[PDB]
Amino acid sequence: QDLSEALKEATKEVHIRAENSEFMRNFQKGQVSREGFKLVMASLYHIYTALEEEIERNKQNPVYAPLYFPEELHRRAALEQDMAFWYGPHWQEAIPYTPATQHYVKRLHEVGGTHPELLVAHAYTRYLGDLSGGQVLKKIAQKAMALPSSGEGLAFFTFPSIDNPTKFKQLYRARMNTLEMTPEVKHRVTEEAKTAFLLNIELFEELQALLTE
Ligand code: HEM
Numbered sequence: 001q002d003l004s005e006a007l008k009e010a011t012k013e014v015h016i017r018a019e020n021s022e023f024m025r026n027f028q029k030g031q032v033s034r035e036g037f038k039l040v041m042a043s044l045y046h047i048y049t050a051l052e053e054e055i056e057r058n059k060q061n062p063v064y065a066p067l068y069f070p071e072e073l074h075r076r077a078a079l080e081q082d083m084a085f086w087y088g089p090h091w092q093e094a095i096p097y098t099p100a101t102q103h104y105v106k107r108l109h110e111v112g113g114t115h116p117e118l119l120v121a122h123a124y125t126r127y128l129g130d131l132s133g134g135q136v137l138k139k140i141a142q143k144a145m146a147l148p149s150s151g152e153g154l155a156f157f158t159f160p161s162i163d164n165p166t167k168f169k170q171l172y173r174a175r176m177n178t179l180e181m182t183p184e185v186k187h188r189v190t191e192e193a194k195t196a197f198l199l200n201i202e203l204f205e206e207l208q209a210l211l212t213e
Contacts, residue, residue, distance in 0.1 A: 003181055003189065004173035007124060010190035014197040019133065023204035027137060030144040036211050037145065038086045041156065042095040043203055045079040050105040051122055052076050054112025063117040063185075066175045071161050072168065073127045078155040085153040100206035104199040111192065117185055120176065121192035125200070128172065130157070131165040 001009075018024070023040070026032060052074050058064045083091040111118045138157035147153050162168045179185075 001186075002177045003120075003179060003186060004176045006186055006190050007121075007176070007193050011125070011193050011197055014194055014201070018197050018201050018204075021201055021204040021208070023208040026208075028140060030140055032141065032144050034086070034145065036207065037141065039096065039098075039207050039210065040204075041079070041082055041086065043098055043101040043207065044075070044156065045083055045095060046097055046101050047104050047108070048075040048079055048126070050108040050112075051126065054108055054116075054119060055123065057112050058116045058119055061116055062180065064119050064123075066178050067120055067123055067172065069172075072159065073123075073130075073162075075130070075156055078158065081155040082153055085155075098203075098206060098210070100199075100203040104203060107195070107199060115188075115192075118189055118192040120179065121189045122196050124176070125193050125196035128169055131159065131162070131169050135165060 019028075023036070026036075052070075055064070055068065055070070055074070059068045083095055087094040108122060111122060134157055138154055141147060141154060141157070142149070145153075151158050159165065159168075
């Protein structure tokens, strides 16, 4: 079975559970507010920072290299623009770093530093979602919070180097299928993707509790 398919099948159940996290339900209904949005986006800033440090560490390693798309996909510089927008000029000392965000970042460095053959699972789980549900969430955010169509504060959701997310996702899947694949790597990559999804769910469960505490 192709890696792209194995991953879709392996993660289709937990995707359902992730898209119905309470935080995401509230978000999708349009009950997202500045405070909650700031929290989630600050947490993503740390997550993508760690993911992309690890992509850079492993960019020439053939277990990852065919998925190396910094110009199209990487989110850190976008997140920095967003953090300056939502948190101001001293955002770096303002932004929170939650325990569930730390947990995710920790696993990211373990994968990038020790199990780089699994790094694809983590790039898959975040980037392809950003090009899918992330586009729906962006429209909702804009409406709920009165964000301007010019993009300020939602640079994370904006991919100026990708003309067509659907066609890009297709390119990316096909490229995943060119990685060197053995049953051991395939098994473990799809397991790590389920883990990635759980790390995301845990983040959201946490952020939701913080907002109701
Ligand atoms: C409200 C929340 C969400 C909605 C409405 C949503 C919606 C979608 C939709 C409609 C697709 C299909 C795209 C396609 O076939 O090209 C998709 C794919 C994806 N989503 Fe989400 N999603 C949400 C949350 C999540 C979260 C939290 C993650 C990960 C943490 C995520 C990760 C993915 C991945 C990795 C894919 C691609 C699956 C594949 O094609 O193999 N999504 N999502």
